[PDB]
């Protein structure tokens, strides 16, 4: 009509309802994968490629979403996975529920600015209330706190019942890769634990490697496959017949030089390898290649050479064993040497046969402790889901060790926040009051979803929860009731701090902040212009 | 070597689109799977907590109901074994009127347990033997499970308490009202003789108000208007004609042959004088209401208005016959005045407006007659059709009680007692028949299991409670739907009862359908035309 834009235009309640519908779609995809009673999903990639998963971030990454207001929630799950590593489903569910209730208010003609102000206020005060009333110090709780946090993260995953053992593995691995640097602050750099998958023996047969596990093998079958007092040389250059560089040409005018030039092309690499081996290096890892001519030198020396190793694996082996990755055998004296100080050490390096394949294990490195985990399941689907679940658990333990605060699970925090914020809304305005009440009510979608998935009376259970938390917030003698949440194996509230259902505070805090940011961004939209492609 | 050829013989001689299945795998198990899928489609509608379904048929007509036979009819069942189970369900509807969902559930359960037994290593023959012997034992047992009897079908409170159960599974929220209405109607049309006809209960669905505004009418209602000027009559003297309200003409071609101006001038006056004489003879017999099954002529209508006769035109012949039964009249094929016996009577005949609809009411004041009508009010045609189905259930229950007055406890009590007793019989029966007897017994558990699942509680605890109470000795105990947690109570003391004949026929038909499906071994479908 009057507007001549070459595209479609949605405006008002139409586009607001559409945005809420999209967000709801995304949240209803993942609601069934929440909590110890949540279930996994198959995803088929249009070719028969199968992916089993409970991770909401993984699900929303694999999906092909068309609506931008739904792409927002997918990116929200991705961001939660990047910054926390857990909560990727809860954050999406909460963002969608905030969107739903806020759009209900906007339909009642509460201005979206007022809804947004109220949501921001409620988010700030919920974060404050958590930090002030709902946290437990992991110092007061010990190491069983880390084990309980790992087991809580592993509930809802395919390493759930085996959590009793997988949590020990995760905790040992994070403590192994613990390192303190300058500024003397303790750092737990997960993604430095290596995770390999090998279908075969049961899950209980999964292994924690004190050392490092390399998805590589020796370069020659004549080389040994076990070395005990391993002197390790990590090289970032290739060991091949030397070729003159691009700006260098051989032009012979005296045939008598051809033989010596051709022989030099190999003697150069021979000399480099002899220099490396003269120091005692019996294990040589390389990011580059190793010609057969060179592999023969390693074979005759009785050394173990490995080629095409990955840069990150090499960096980790070097840091763990005490070695220095060399891009060149070149010193500050204009010569070529290899010092025995550039070597690393390990009490054993072996080529181990896992299932029908082989990998290399570097065991008991000195100058640092390292950790690898070989997951063992029934097929690649199980192994990939175990890898994802274990990554979640490692991230959770990392957060618990970095910030020493945890909160109870099972909807305890959400029930407490619902109570406290529905009481707190009474003080702030009249429409921001409704917005804060709706934020509070939205927070209840987590215990509601937990109970629904547990196939229990969500209404009764969440009412009992809220009653407990109201008693806790109105009777100062019963403040220990804060720790009550859902027991989804029996459909009855329970002291989750004593049951061991713990979450890192950062999980809930970041979930709330990100969900609020997403809800505000989606609620700010009152128009949509979709241009026809060209 | 990249193609498997059809084997020589039947595989090659088979037509293009024809299919042939043979053996336990291709035929027996696929039939059992189909019947299981059917039972699953209708399981969630069983019982008072049973949910309705919104079926749209190929004609885009909408059915909102939890009546199993209706759902099956409006579904396009295409698997032949499922068709056979549906035939069993429809035979149950024909014989009894209620229990079709029992038939489906029980048949599906028998077939699933039969598949399990075939997998453990029994032969279809042994399974069938055990199922038949166990059906015989169930029929031997049920008479002993009969708890109460009607003891009076001329009362209105007892009949309501008896019909409430059948009209509770359908229309759970409002069942006291409906049982009252259906009891009033059934005992109005119940004659001194023990014979009861269900077609004599008429149902008029009028849009407007709601199910609580429904009523019973000792008489008849027709969504018609009156042809003439008279609209009400207080001491009806009804005269009924299957012929039109016009001058009789020849069945052979008639021609008015005029040959003189006098004949031409007098023919039409003679016709009207004839009509006036006919209608005046009818009026002078005392008739104030005339009901014609054919058309009405303008001159005859003129003279009926002149002589103050209410004219009614009923297109249908079933409607005409039922009106005759109502008023005590005889449909005359000639326009001759009726004799004192051929005439019908009604304490009132009037035109009213129920809602937007105009209706002609032949209403007796006495609390009896040969025909009664239930005027169903409701805010939706679909709702009124579902309530009509519930009315049909109540009326068919009344007829089943006129045939056999015996009653068994509901809510799964009889099913649990049957399961227990047949299990005790199979534990004594040696030979491979005991497996099939015990599975036939365990199939009964599907009924309280379906009730519990729909009530919204755990069927295993419900069934364990029932088994424990029936072991302690209470055969009238069944599950309580008015309990959020698994519970049980005295079905007799609660008034939740089923019909001995209903259970008898449902068990018989379900067993027969399952046994036929099992007796099938090869299937040769033709190309779907």
């Amino acid at each position: 009509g009057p507007l001549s834009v070459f595209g479609d235009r949605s405006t008002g309640e139409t586009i607001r309802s559409q945005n809420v519908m999209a967000a709801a779609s995304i949240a209803n995809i993942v609601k069934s994968s929440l909590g110890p009673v949540g279930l996994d999903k198959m995803l088929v990639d249009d070719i028969g490629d199968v992916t089993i998963t409970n991770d909401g971030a993984t699900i929303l990454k694999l999906l092909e979403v068309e609506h931008p207001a739904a792409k927002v929630l997918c990116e929200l799950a991705d961001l939660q996975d990047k910054e926390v590593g857990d909560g990727t489903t809860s954050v999406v569910i909460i963002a969608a529920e905030l969107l739903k209730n806020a759009d209900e208010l906007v339909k009642q003609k509460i201005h979206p600015t007022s809804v947004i102000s109220g949501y921001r206020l409620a988010c700030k005060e919920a974060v404050r209330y958590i930090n002030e009333n709902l946290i437990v110090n992991t110092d007061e709780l010990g190491r069983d706190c880390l084990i309980n946090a790992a087991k809580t993260s592993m509930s809802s995953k395919i390493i759930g019942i085996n959590g009793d053992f997988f949590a020990n593995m995760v905790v040992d691995a994070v403590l192994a890769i613990k390192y303190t640097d300058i500024r003397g602050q303790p750092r737990y750099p997960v993604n430095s634990v290596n995770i390999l998958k090998a279908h075969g023996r049961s899950q209980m047969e999964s292994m924690l490697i004190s050392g490092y596990a390399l998805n590589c093998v020796v370069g020659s079958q004549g080389m040994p496959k076990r070395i005990v007092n391993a002197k390790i040389a990590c090289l970032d250059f290739s060991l091949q017949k030397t070729k003159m560089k691009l700006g260098v040409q051989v032009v012979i005018t005296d045939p008598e030089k051809l033989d010596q030039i051709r022989q030099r092309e190999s003697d150069i690499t021979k000399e480099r390898i002899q220099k490396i081996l003269a120091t005692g290096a019996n294990v040589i890892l390389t990011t580059g290649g190793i010609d057969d001519m060179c592999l023969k030198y390693f074979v005759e020396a009785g050394a173990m050479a490995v080629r095409r190793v990955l840069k990150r694996d090499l960096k980790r082996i070097a840091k763990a064993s005490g070695a220095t990755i060399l891009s060149t055998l070149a010193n500050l004296e204009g010569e070529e040497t290899f010092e025995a100080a550039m070597l690393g050490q390990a009490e054993e390096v072996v080529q181990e046969r896992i299932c029908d394949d082989e990998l290399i294990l570097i065991k008991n490195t000195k100058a640092r402790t390292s950790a690898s985990i070989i997951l063992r399941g029934a097929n690649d689907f199980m192994c990939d889901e175990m890898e994802r679940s274990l990554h979640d658990a490692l991230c959770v333990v990392k957060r618990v060790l970095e910030s020493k605060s945890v909160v109870p699970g099972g909807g305890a925090v959400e029930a407490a926040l619902s109570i406290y914020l529905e009481n707190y809304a009474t003080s702030m305005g009249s429409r921001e009051q409704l917005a804060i009440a709706e934020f509070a009510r939205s927070l209840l979608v987590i215990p509601n979803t937990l109970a629904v998935n547990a196939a229990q009376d969500s209404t009764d259970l969440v009412a009992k929860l809220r009653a407990f938390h109201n008693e806790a917030q109105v009777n100062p003698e019963r403040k220990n009731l804060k720790w009550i949440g859902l027991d989804l194996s029996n459909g009855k509230p329970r002291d989750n701090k004593q049951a061991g259902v713990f979450e890192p505070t950062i999980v809930k805090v970041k979930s709330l902040k990100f969900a609020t940011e997403a809800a505000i961004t989606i609620l700010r939209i009152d128009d949509l212009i979709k241009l026809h492609p060209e | 070597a990249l193609h498997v050829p059809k084997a020589p013989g039947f595989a090659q001689m088979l037509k293009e689109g024809a299919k042939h299945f043979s053996g336990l795998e291709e035929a027996v198990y696929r039939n059992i799977q189909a019947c299981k899928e059917l039972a699953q489609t209708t399981r969630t509608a069983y019982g008072p907590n049973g949910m309705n379904k919104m079926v749209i048929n190929h004609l885009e007509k909408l059915f909102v109901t939890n009546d199993a036979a209706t759902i099956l009819r409006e579904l396009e069942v295409q698997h032949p074994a499922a068709k056979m189970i549906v035939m069993a369900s429809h035979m149950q509807e024909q014989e009894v009127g209620d229990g079709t969902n029992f038939v489906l559930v029980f048949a599906g359960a028998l077939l699933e347990l039969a598949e399990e037994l075939l997998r453990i290593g029994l032969s279809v023959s042994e399974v069938i033997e055990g199922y038949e012997i166990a059906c015989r034992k169930a029929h031997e047992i049920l008479p002993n499970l009969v708890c109460c009897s009607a003891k009076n079908l001329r009362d209105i409170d007892e009949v309501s308490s008896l019909l409430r159960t059948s009209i509770m599974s359908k229309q759970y929220g409002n069942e006291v009202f409906l049982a009252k209405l259906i009891a009033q109607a059934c005992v109005s049309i119940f004659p001194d003789s023990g014979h009861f006809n269900v077609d004599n209960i008429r149902v008029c669905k009028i849009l407007g108000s709601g199910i609580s505004s429904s009523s019973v009418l000792h008489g008849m209602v027709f969504k018609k208007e009156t042809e003439g000027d008279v609209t009400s009559v207080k001491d009806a003297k009804i005269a009924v004609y299957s012929c039109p309200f016009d001058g009789m003409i020849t069945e052979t071609k008639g021609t008015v042959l005029i040959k003189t101006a006098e004949e031409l001038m007098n023919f039409s006056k003679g016709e009207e004088n004839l009509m006036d004489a006919q209608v005046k003879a009818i009026a002078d017999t005392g008739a104030n209401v005339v009901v014609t099954g054919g058309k009405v002529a303008d001159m005859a209508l003129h003279y009926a208005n002149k002589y103050n006769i209410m004219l009614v035109r009923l297109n249908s012949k079933w409607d005409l016959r039922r009106l005759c039964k109502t008023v005590g009249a005889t449909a005359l094929p000639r326009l001759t005045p009726p004799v004192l016996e051929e005439m019908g009577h009604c304490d009132s005949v009037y035109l009213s407006e129920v809602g937007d609809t105009q209706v002609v009411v032949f209403k007796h004041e006495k609390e009896d007659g040969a025909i009664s009508t239930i005027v169903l009010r409701g805010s939706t045609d679909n709702l009124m059709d579902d309530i009509e189905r519930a009315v049909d259930d109540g009326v068919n229950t009344f007829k089943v009680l006129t045939r056999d007055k015996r009653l068994v406890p509901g809510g799964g009590a009889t099913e649990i007692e049957l399961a227990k007793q047949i299990t005790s019989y199979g534990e004594t029966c040696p030979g491979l028949e005991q497996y099939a007897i015990k599975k036939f017994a365990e199939a009964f558990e599907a009924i309280p299991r379906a009730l519990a699942e729909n009530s919204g509680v755990k069927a295993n605890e419900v069934i364990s409670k029932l088994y424990a109470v029936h072991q302690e000795g209470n055969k009238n105990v069944g599950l309580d739907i008015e309990a959020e947690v698994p519970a049980v109570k005295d079905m007799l003391e609660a008034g939740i009862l089923d019909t001995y004949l209903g259970k008898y026929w449902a068990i018989k038909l379900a067993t027969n359908a399952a046994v036929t499906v099992l007796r099938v071994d090869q299937i040769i479908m033709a190309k779907p035309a």
Binding site: Q108, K109, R431, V452, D457, S458, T459, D460, A463 | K19, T41, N49, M51, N52, K53, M54, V55, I56, H58, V64, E74, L75, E76, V77, Q78, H79, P80, G173, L207, G208, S209, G210, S212, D229, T231, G254, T255, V256, I258, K259, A261, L264, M265, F267, S268, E272, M299, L301, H302, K306, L351, E353, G355, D356, G378, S379, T380, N382, L383, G456
Partner: protein
């Protein structure tokens, strides 16, 4: 290998199916929301033929929408049922049903058993219905001036949403006179409604008599007179023209004298019919059947009026007004069967010629003659008057009045909140949701008016809990007011049936757990 159902069977099952049913109902409600109340708007729908219908009437709008959703068809059906049983409340019923569904949507998503929800709906419906019957105002005087005032106020309320709201006192007085001159059955076929394009709403009129459009006159009709000052009226079902005395009649003559006798005999048959009609004293003649040119000219020469092919409904109205009987035979034309009026006239009304029988004191009939600038203008005027007429009939039969502007909904919402705060706690939430749903009527009034429904609903909730039961939305002041004193009156049966139908529809929709579409 072999499938249970026919290929193409679409089955939607479970909580998603139920939530989708509720959402479709929300769509259907949205389609009529903005028509509610004095600030309500009209909808323009167009058919495949390109013919447009313009209406504020919710039943009409939903009939025109080609709704196919099985659950959303239920709202259309209950709007039809409301228009049938009452004639008003069609938008309110749909809004209420959709709001019940919306209010229980969260619990449905959170796994609340539909049986529990329907039990709560039934309970709250019975409570609200009994409460309406309890607090409904029934003046126990049976006074005629006050009962005409009451009907007039209920009609003005029923008309305060249409395009004739600026003439609603006019049209309400006319509707009340119309339904008060009817017989006991209050038949709608006894009120005629003519639509004469051209003219203003205030130029519309009611004739205490009967009126119908001129009907295919032959030659000599202009030679006839067009005004009679005490005519007797012959109402007939008689074809007055030279015709085959019968279709299966065959004349056979063998003589020219007999031939001429037969010709003259046809003419004498006709002339004798006409001469009897003339000797009955009737100066006006109406036939449901044609009146030929010969009869037309005969009556013109006798200075009589004749009209043939008159429609059956107009004939019956003329009968009920003038006081005669319709005759298939002209052989007994007594003064008992002849009709009578004080004036008969043929006048021009906006391009058409209309015959008016006016002055009938024994008239149990009236004819509305509606003017306006468009076919759809006049059609929506007719629909508005139909609303008012049905309201007035129901009020005549049961003068039990409640107040509008959302007063009754706020009173029932308060009462049901009170009741819900006294019950275990599962039904508590659901009956409170019922109560919160009842507030959709004043909320939608304020929305369509352009107010802040939030502040107005706060004011109303406060004033209904302080004591006061007829406080509702005041539209012209953007405030609240005692609507029973402001005379925003509504027969109680309107809202009774609205709640009944809405609750039944909601219970049905919530009881459906599976939808199975067979392929066509």
């Amino acid at each position: 290998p072999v499938i249970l159902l026919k290929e193409g069977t679409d089955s939607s099952q479970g909580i998603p199916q139920l939530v989708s049913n509720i959402s479709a109902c929300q769509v259907i409600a949205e389609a009529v929301r903005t028509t509610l109340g004095p600030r309500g708007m009209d909808k323009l729908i167009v058919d495949g033929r390109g013919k447009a219908t313009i209406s504020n009437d919710g039943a009409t709008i939903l009939k025109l929408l080609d709704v196919v959703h099985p659950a959303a068809k239920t709202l259309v059906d209950i709007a039809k049922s409301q228009d049938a049983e009452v004639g008003d409340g069609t938008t309110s019923v749909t809004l209420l049903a959709a709001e019940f569904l919306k209010q229980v949507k969260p619990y449905v998503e959170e796994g609340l058993h539909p049986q529990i929800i329907i039990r709560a709906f039934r309970t709250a419906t019975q409570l609200a219905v009994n409460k309406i019957k309890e607090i409904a105002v029934t003046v126990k005087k049976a006074d005629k001036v006050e009962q005409r005032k009451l009907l007039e106020k209920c009609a003005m309320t029923a008309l305060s949403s249409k395009l004739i709201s600026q003439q609603k006192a006019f049209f309400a007085k006319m509707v009340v006179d119309a339904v008060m001159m009817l017989d006991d059955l209050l038949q709608l076929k006894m009120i005629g409604i003519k639509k004469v394009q051209g003219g203003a709403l205030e130029d519309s009129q009611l004739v205490a008599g009967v009126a119908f459009k001129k009907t295919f006159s032959y030659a000599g009709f202009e030679m006839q007179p067009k005004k009679y000052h005490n005519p007797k009226i012959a109402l007939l079902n008689v074809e007055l023209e030279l015709k085959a005395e019968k279709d299966n009649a065959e004349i056979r003559v063998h003589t020219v004298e007999d031939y001429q006798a037969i010709v003259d005999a046809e003419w004498n048959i006709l002339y004798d019919k006409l001469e009897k009609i003339h000797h009955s004293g009737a100066k006006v003649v109406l036939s449901k059947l044609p009146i030929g040119d010969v009869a037309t000219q005969y009556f013109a020469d006798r200075d009589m009026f004749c009209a043939g092919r008159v429609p059956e409904e107009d004939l019956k109205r003329t009968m009920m007004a003038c006081g005669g009987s319709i005759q298939t035979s002209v052989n007994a034309l007594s003064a008992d069967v002849l009709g009578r009026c004080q004036v008969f006239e043929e006048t021009q009304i906006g391009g058409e010629r209309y015959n008016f029988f006016t002055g009938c004191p024994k008239a149990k009939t009236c004819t509305f003659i509606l003017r306006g600038g468009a076919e759809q203008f006049m059609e929506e005027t007719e629909r508005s008057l139909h609303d008012a007429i049905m309201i007035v009939r129901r009020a005549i039969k049961n003068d039990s009045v409640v107040a509008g502007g959302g007063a009754i909904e706020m009173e029932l919402s308060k009462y049901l909140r009170d009741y819900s705060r006294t019950i275990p706690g599962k039904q508590q939430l659901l009956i409170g949701a019922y109560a919160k749903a009842l507030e959709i009527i004043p909320r939608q009034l304020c929305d369509n008016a352009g107010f802040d429904a939030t502040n107005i609903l706060n004011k109303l909730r406060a004033r209904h809990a302080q004591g006061g039961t007829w406080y509702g939305v005041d539209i012209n002041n953007e405030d609240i007011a005692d609507n029973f004193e402001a005379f925003v009156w509504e027969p109680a049966m309107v809202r009774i049936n609205a709640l009944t139908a809405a609750s039944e529809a909601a219970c049905l929709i919530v009881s459906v757990d599976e939808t199975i579409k067979n392929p066509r």
